[model samples]
Target chain A: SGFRKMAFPSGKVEGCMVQVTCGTTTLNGLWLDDVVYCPRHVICTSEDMLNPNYEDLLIRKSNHNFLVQAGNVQLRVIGHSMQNCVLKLKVDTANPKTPKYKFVRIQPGQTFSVLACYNGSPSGVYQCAMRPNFTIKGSFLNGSCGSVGFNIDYDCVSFCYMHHMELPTGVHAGTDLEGNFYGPFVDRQTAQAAGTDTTITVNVLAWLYAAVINGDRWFLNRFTTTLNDFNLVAMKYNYEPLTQDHVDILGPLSAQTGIAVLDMCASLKELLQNGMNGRTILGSALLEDEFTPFDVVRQCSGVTFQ
Target chain B: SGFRKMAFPSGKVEGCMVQVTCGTTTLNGLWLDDVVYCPRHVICTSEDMLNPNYEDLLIRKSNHNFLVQAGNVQLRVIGHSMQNCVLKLKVDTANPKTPKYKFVRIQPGQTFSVLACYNGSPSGVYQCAMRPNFTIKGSFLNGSCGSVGFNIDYDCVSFCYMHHMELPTGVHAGTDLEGNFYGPFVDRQTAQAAGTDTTITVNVLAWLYAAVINGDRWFLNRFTTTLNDFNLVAMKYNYEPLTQDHVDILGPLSAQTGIAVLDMCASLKELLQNGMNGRTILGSALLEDEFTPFDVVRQCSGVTFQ
Candidate 1:
């Protein structure tokens, strides 16, 4: 007899459920079941080398019509041991908290994590109750999947770390305060305490200017206003996946126009992608120069990403 | 001078315009522009394709985004051009009867028509606008487009022939007697008559049945009630595209189920598509026999087409 050693995978079956991250906002949400995603549709996950089992595949109960909506990324489960089982999915249209939903009795082991459709906003719990029954036991013999049951539970939520800060408002308009609250002042504690628990609207430009001018009154309103604009500015510049042509345009604009618009603001882009701690103040203040800045105007002037 | 006879075959440029046939119902005094389709993206139709003027190709306006969103088409003119030179366009908004809203404008000599994209609904309107400086002379330019202007005048009223009889709340709330008049019976005169007009409120369906049943009050209600179930019965057969399928499903259903749902108590699909002219009364009388005496479906079966 030839000597041989066989090793089964970690799970009871020979495959595993991989976590797929569909971080982009465009291709998120909408229940998808039945249809399998090929490599062309999977964006963030590494290519898997195994063929998927279709017959025993159980997909969540979602209107397939709406699931494959235009502009959505498709992440397919590549390898699984079973297929073609009735999937019973119950979506709780009534719960606010712990609004748990479930997809049970799925035959197909290659399943899409339902939360991927909801992007990072999936806050509820999900459970998978399934028994991979591919074949019946023969007389005086047993089937490989006779005892195989593919059942599990999972949850999804926001993946980012959020930071909380408190600042003052200089001007007031109902609930809105514009400009005036920079730093290093005697009234810092009093300003922070007044609405610390409430919402602290920071205007980076205002605070920076206030620091420079050494104004007596706090510049909270102006600081909050400018800071908000700066935030949007940073987001818009970094979010779009730019092309080489776009880089070329930005390079010249940044050099000749005295300010960089879009990708030229690489400093701001890096901060948003990696972390948003320090320059939170620096970026905001530096960005608050003009009401309608030069960078934005420059980027929009006859610009197209290749 | 070497060769005596020479031949040159020029490529043909098809103008962007298609004839449309929207059904009868008028919408906002406009008809659906169905038949004349357009592409989803831009289709360039340059003026002087026969003449070939270099000035026509030059980008004109220094800083302005010329956008013309009219009817079912959206057009945006980029850069600049001389006077009188035109840009032709094709449009894609599927429904017919283009509308003219205040926000839209059409420059003279600039014409847009419909074309096809994916052989289905078009995406946007193709445009041809007169170049600014080329006005007085054959190639003479007019002033910048600032003073030059055109209007998107919507004269034709096209109709979108929808499959399902839209039972919108206002005038056609299935409950409204006027709402009962579908297909051929839905003429302007009858709609205005029996309070079917904007003001009156009678049981249009019942009245229609009554008109057909010739004062058979009981049978009239029965028929109206049966017609209400048409959607459900129709769905059982997958709303057979052709009338023959309707006859087949109805004939067998009537034989097995004992329901006289069709023309010879045969097929209502043909009757519904081509419509009934003088046989309204007979059709109405037979409708009641489908339910009660035949299958007896109490309410709408729920399935309906878009």
Candidate 2:
């Protein structure tokens, strides 16, 4: 079989979208339907990283803009020269009161959560801005504040969590306050009702998308770990058929369009092998590349199925 | 004497400061005390003004950065490519309720205000982002959005209003909910207390400074109107001596230091005249230049005054 169970096994297709890059060469011509998948590699050069002055990245980061994620809400950070930021829930703008903030140091390569106050008497909108005085090692240093801004949703917590975990078309899940996951909601209202009914479920695809879109290195690492685990299971089973549960999250396309998940997975494996095994199109040999299952089929056979 | 009333007429030193320019030459080296005064011209160049990208002004507009403003309580637009844009507050993020936004036509040179939510269950922070869909006259034009990002304070209305009106050593005023002006606060507490007491006042000097600092054309127009009003009264009265009200806002320097506001205002008037009427230092002619009262006194005479 072209797709034999090899020394290094392949994982199931993560999403309908995939990023393609090889060293410094990024493929921009690849597209599936209306969606164009760009390279996953960091396009930002060392010289183009965050400077103390935040004005430089205004237009440069438009396509790959900063994403603001609260514990339960996601919002886009907007403004000029806004970078190296943090936020806190305020006691309401009407009553001028101090924010309950303690001096917390964010060490190198660490994740920290900023709190949001969604409800209460003093429940006011969260306030965030550039930390002008953020210092490291008790000294003012450039790029010490690494955040630009965040795009937070209006309602905190559940709404954000729901959006982050599940795509619009997928089976939605939510955990109740009691920590029980419930429902693979088919519609918007049913999915939202799960929140009122006090049930919570994790939406893996949404979470994965957020991680990749936001350039969140920490979250990306977590996603990579989860993928590694999933791959290990697939490798043990000779990359067996993707379960219905997997189809619910990844999409029902391969199943609905009469292409078995096993076959789709094989196609992806073949594309990777050929990319590694001297595949050439325009006299340029493909050394390394990435693509979704659909993209792999399109690239290999020039036949696109939605 | 040499300080006789001017032939044409004299005007107030417009916020205890004046900007002078000679032909196309701008004053850059002039300074007094610790204040580094730059040119008062619209530093935004033709090539750099209101690009659709809104990114070119990053380092170039360091001295003339953007300013965000809000009459009510809305966040200023922030983003690398955020400009020529506006927003309407949504119902809330959780319900994902649709905002009552009509696709209204934004004509050129037209003024518009965006709404913001500050409190209540739907008390969500204002959200704005770049709109590639914003069109006019059926053309995808550049500079279609004439907005630059504004560096606004966290509390949009109060912070902006407070900074625009009151200098540290000057008097301050604010309007109340009932739209009545009150206060020439001698200290910080009193001025802030006025907020609690519910009164609002306009600080023209602070407003001018803010407009100048942020390069806000809209507010700058408003500042010019206020300046015209103040100048008419001052010029009509021989650039009258700074009264206690003036001292309250400008400073108590002339009052406490035994220098009459009349003499001080006269010195400014003389500096303008010299700048206008062929004043030269180090073989360089001074045409249109800007300076504080202190700078005027230092340039005119080596004598230093508080």
Candidate 3:
């Protein structure tokens, strides 16, 4: 099968790696052998496989390691053009800090979850991310004292999973990290069905949009890419703090059906721009009957300020 | 039974007048009647006796001839207590410029919802409160449209409801004087239930408590009575938006179930002030089994800005 494009508002990828297993064979060889040496993540169409499309391969920065055991484990492949890829990590068994890992090849539609461990170590947060192309980013949500058996529970806001065992002492050290690295370590269908295939939620995305839309040069360089007003609403259920009237507009309509009212001017600047223009559109032509009209210009509309 | 004090917050008793049936019912009814007239809204609790508790004397305000009716229906009363009472009309009903009605009497636990009909009338907002008792104070909860139906839709943020109906054609004229005459009408619960409720949410009460805790004079006149910090938490749920962790504190170890977290704070304050500061205080008391003495003190060591 050929490769197709996967679009996101921004060019950030957020996933964790799982071991990549090529099709049914106990003994396997002669796969995409050169995939590991490629400079970028590969987007392979069937026609270009023999010669290979050089531009399709997108090699992202590797920021992970294995301290518990030094062996082969695959990096998770982010889905973009040529999605399927396998990754393997060969940790430097000699060094305690400078742990490193590598990648192999992936097919199409592979998925997995990634994790951070802290058994018998100092308390610290770790982060890994798939960059620019099919890039997923994430960080160690929780932190323990890092001592193997002596970790302590700090707070409930800690990010955790039921799938993992007792977490090692790890603290979230960086707030700036955008996502988790190398994930969907399983098949795509299984991940999506289990809801394990994570995407950024509306509230969080709104914040990201706010940070980028403000012309914050830093956030712009990082998160701003292709996401527009429509893409945001169509993909996620957006929620912002609102007033009674705002509540009224969103309630009956959405409650009756699966429609939504996306606020284009949540960040004060967008609202002011609309105010200067004297009109702000609330709904779409696609779902006009399902949403309330914003044609009626009412004053003092915003419930929450950015 | 002796008089039992009932606390009815924001209840309404309007459009009511009933006969005492047969009674030397006292006009000097202890509380509400002392300020107004005699047993008009007299509901008799006893079917056997003419003289009964106000609850038993069922009375619903009925239309009379004065309000453009064809026949006269003078109000009747059986109690001797109202024998000497005289209700005078201060305004000339015949004059279009004068008000048709003045002053309404309502008891606690009564509710009324009326449509404020105004057209070509100078638009404005009105508030019906226990006046000197207290006024509901709402902040800029994301919008300036306090009373949206009126011309002041986006100009102010106050406790107000909206009505879409207008006065039956020209039975009324377009004058500010005529508009003011419309409603000292009871606010309706049904209207609120029917999705026309335009009041602030319960969170405003928390804001009031926050004001009191900080001892801010700005909130004194509005909240009316001076309150201690303890009462602030005990009285308003808005003050502490309960995150999941806060809910866990009182889970099963609660001494008083359904008493609300704020009420618990009030009780604690009362005990602390009376020189009964026990070993287990606010944080320590709740953490009796969950935390050690050292741990309790450690966790409690945080800044309280207000």
- Evaluate every candidate with DockQ and list the scores: 0.01, 0.01, 0.01
Quality class of the docking in candidate 2, CAPRI style: incorrect
Ranking by lDDT: 2, 1, 3
Off by over 4 Å in 1: A1-78, A81-306, B1-73, B76-169, B172-250, B258-306
What's the C-alpha lDDT at position A164 in model 2? Answer: 10
TM-score of every candidate relative to the true structure: 0.17, 0.17, 0.18
lDDT of 2 at B56: 38
Which tens-of-lDDT digit does each residue in B1-306 have in candidate 3?
000000111111111111111232211111122122222222222242333233223222222211111012222221222221121112112222111222333221112111111111111111121111111111111111111111111112111222211122101111011122123321111121111222121222322222222222231221221225644543342222333343344433223223344444444334333422222221121111112111112112211000
What's the CA RMSD for each of the models?
28.4, 30.3, 26.8
Worst 10-residue lDDT window, candidate 3 chain A: A2-11
RMSD of 3: 26.8
Question: Model 1, B206: alpha-carbon shift in Å?
Answer: 17
Model 3 lDDT, residue B45, Cα: 23
Candidate 2 lDDT tens digits, B112-152: 11111111111111111111111111110111111111111
Query: In candidate 1, what are the lDDT values of residues B91-155, reduced to their tens digit?
Result: 23333323322222222122222111111111111111111111110100111011111121222
lDDT of 2 by residue, A58-114 (tens): 335443243322222332323212211211111111211111212222211111111
TM-score of 1: 0.17
Stretch of 10 with least lDDT, candidate 2 chain B: B1-10
